Amino acid sequence: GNKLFNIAQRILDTNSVLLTERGDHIVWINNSWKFNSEEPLITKLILSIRHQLPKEYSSELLCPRKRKTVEANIRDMLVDSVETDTYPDKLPFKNGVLDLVDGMFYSGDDAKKYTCTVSTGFKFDDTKFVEDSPEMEELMNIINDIQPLTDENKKNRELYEKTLSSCLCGATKGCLTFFFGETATGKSTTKRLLKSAIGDLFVETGQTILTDVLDKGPNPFIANMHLKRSVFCSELPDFACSGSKKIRSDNIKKLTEPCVIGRPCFSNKINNRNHATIIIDTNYKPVFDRIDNALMRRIAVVRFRTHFSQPSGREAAENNDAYDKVKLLDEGLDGKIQNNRYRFAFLYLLVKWYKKYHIPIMKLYPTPEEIPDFAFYLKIGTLLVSSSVKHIPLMTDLSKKGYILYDNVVTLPLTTFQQKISKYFNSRLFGHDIESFINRHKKFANVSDEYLQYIFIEDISSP
Amino acid sequence: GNKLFNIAQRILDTNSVLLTERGDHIVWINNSWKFNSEEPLITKLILSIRHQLPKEYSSELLCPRKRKTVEANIRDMLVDSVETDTYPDKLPFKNGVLDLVDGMFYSGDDAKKYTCTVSTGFKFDDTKFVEDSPEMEELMNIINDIQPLTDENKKNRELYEKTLSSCLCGATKGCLTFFFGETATGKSTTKRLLKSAIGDLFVETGQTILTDVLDKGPNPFIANMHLKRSVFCSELPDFACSGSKKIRSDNIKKLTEPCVIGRPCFSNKINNRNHATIIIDTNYKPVFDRIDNALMRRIAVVRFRTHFSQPSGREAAENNDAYDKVKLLDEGLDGKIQNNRYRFAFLYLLVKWYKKYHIPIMKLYPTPEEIPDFAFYLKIGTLLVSSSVKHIPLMTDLSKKGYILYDNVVTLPLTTFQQKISKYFNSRLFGHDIESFINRHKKFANVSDEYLQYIFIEDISSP
């Protein structure tokens, strides 16, 4: 009774077709979850799977009409929806899924349970995923050359390792990392090593996402980051000199939210998943058009201070302090990195670092103290407070310091505020910052007189 | 007699397919009313319901052609339209609909009567819906700490309870309540309570709603609140300081309307249903760009006077103007609330509050005396009525007050207006409001002078 319905039931029992929330069907052919909007693969799956069925069921799948009927039955049978790429601690390869927490590699039906629709693009070989090897020693030597293990570099080394290891997690990250350092320091070598390690999950982008609008009209720059696990920004022009667009605070805020707004060309989908670890490479200090408290919590800085240079310019390179350690470059090193020589050794190192930081919740912590542009705004935030409970049993003593009373609200005249704030910062050095803060946070008692609703902590602490 | 027509008649007798006024079909599969504009689920429903039918009818539903014939019959049979989500007194869950008038929980066919297309997203447990429990005691203690039941907080507590209970009713609300509460006073705790209690019907927004155009073009922020029952906006910056846009009058007017005009990307729809309660959370008093009688009627204010702070900042948390009382904070409370510990206790409390305010007509009430912006207009509104037909046989004594009759409309000079308004209103305290009134409600008399179609109540109350 209904051979075709029984065939559809068996194919559904094999769990090879799933219905997604967007209305598509994902099929498991050739050991990978595939889908297509313009050409479903359900009949391809039926023809391919005809070999696992009994004899009397296999000869009914050689007709396109019967395969169409089976596909209709399968479409009617699938009611509930599932979500794809819901495991943040799994790295999908071309022939399986690697577990970062456990270190065990799966293949075929074992990798089937993790609905991974993306992959690194290359196979995984266990014979090279080993600890003892000359490749491991060479990689360790290179890594120690780029980042020394001195006691003055411990925190920087830890942050570097954490940032590099977070590129394997398939979840939204809450920070952006700046790779601070001059040219010929090792940042490009790290970029090439990471690209060789993680294959197709790595993408590179210029200045478009930093200094330009994100949504606008069409934007392949923000639509090509869907399900990527790392984004590297390189060749960034100095924003200190006039003529270059500044870093947009709105862009930084949007590149951190779990939902990214943007659509590709000729696509009706506007929502894409953001899994990338954004790293910005710059040879100069970064400056932003706007600075506020929210933008301070989404920036981290990693500093590079060891360079490799030719013997001809060895003295000049040894003639400063930003190149804290001097070494000799290797001409064939670029070819070795390109030839995928250290790919699996770097994969092992990244997995080991991830395990070293595999605490139940993996998060990226901002480091705002390393940005010179944040120096003024960080210090003033520890000097002023907002409105609070009852200044009434201090207005006797707060009045003598220049604070006035207004409808039971303490304000401060601009002249008195300037006089009290000039004792902590140089007028010339922070003039623009002081002016911007004053004109941003000023309150108008009337059209002419103006006041500020801020109280210095030093006055508060002093009885 | 046409077995397939009999099958379609039975499936229609089960009341599982309904035709909506918009032209779509909603089917009852997996205990929920789903629909798909681009792909009807009628054949899925036929295949699923094939089990309830007699034995000789179930075998015919295993063929896609016969299912399509039954679907054609069913489509021809459905003539009348129905309206979806028209019960404001019902809270839909994932596995049933819980009434609020008396308080039973329906399930399956019992909840089938109310066509609710949305749900809180979590299953309902009757075991935890108990009045007597340690969780209820802890929640009551937290609520009492948040809003004390003292003699100075009766009306405030009543309005707070009314606002929290009004987040369950699925109808359009007429007021935009202002949660006038300062930082670390407890508004965050109430927000997490409400979110955990009402699940997916709760959404959170930011500054874009209040201080930006809502219609514009494709606005996901507006299209998101379709059939939502609560909207919470937090982290709102101080609008008193310059550089921050004021609250738009048109936005406030538009949010209250039952029909909100707005479209999503790649969607032909332009109309949605507004059911949400909008609560504004600011640490500072609000500032409106343009105020008048209309906005004064759509604002309610809730005050919080129990603030918590750390000991280091406690002195700084007591040396300004904005709070009234200090208390102590709890650290594990946030983890407890994230663990959905008090979800059902808060649900029971909200149901009890709704019952207390369950008069046959549910309507929110505005309180304009708590906003200093409308204080001047309220005093102005209660101190002015224009000229009178009865003023015609009293304009002789009204002429002594600096008023001149003109086509039965009496006038006041600008300088005389300022002189007479200085009697009741302080010139400096409300100078901006007075001059805005002068330039907003003025008319013209001749080339050089200006005219006013308004007269003070005080000039008429005094004989």
From TrEMBL, chains A, B:
Molecular-function annotations in GO: ATP binding; helicase activity; hydrolase activity
Keywords: ATP-binding, Helicase, Hydrolase, Nucleotide-binding
Domain of life of the native organism: Viruses
Limits of the SF3 helicase domain: 155-317
Keyword Nucleotide-binding: yes
Function: Multifunctional protein required for genome uncoating and replication. Major viral uncoating protein that is required for the release of the viral genome from incoming viral cores containing the viral DNA genome. Possesses an ATPase activity that is required for hexamerization and uncoating.
Family: Belongs to the orthopoxvirus OPG117 family.
Subunit structure as annotated in this protein's UniProt entry: Homomultimer; hexamer. Interacts with OPG148.
Protein name (Swiss-Prot/TrEMBL): Uncoating factor OPG117
Species in which this protein is naturally found: Monkeypox virus
Section of the entire sequence shown: 323 to 785 of 785
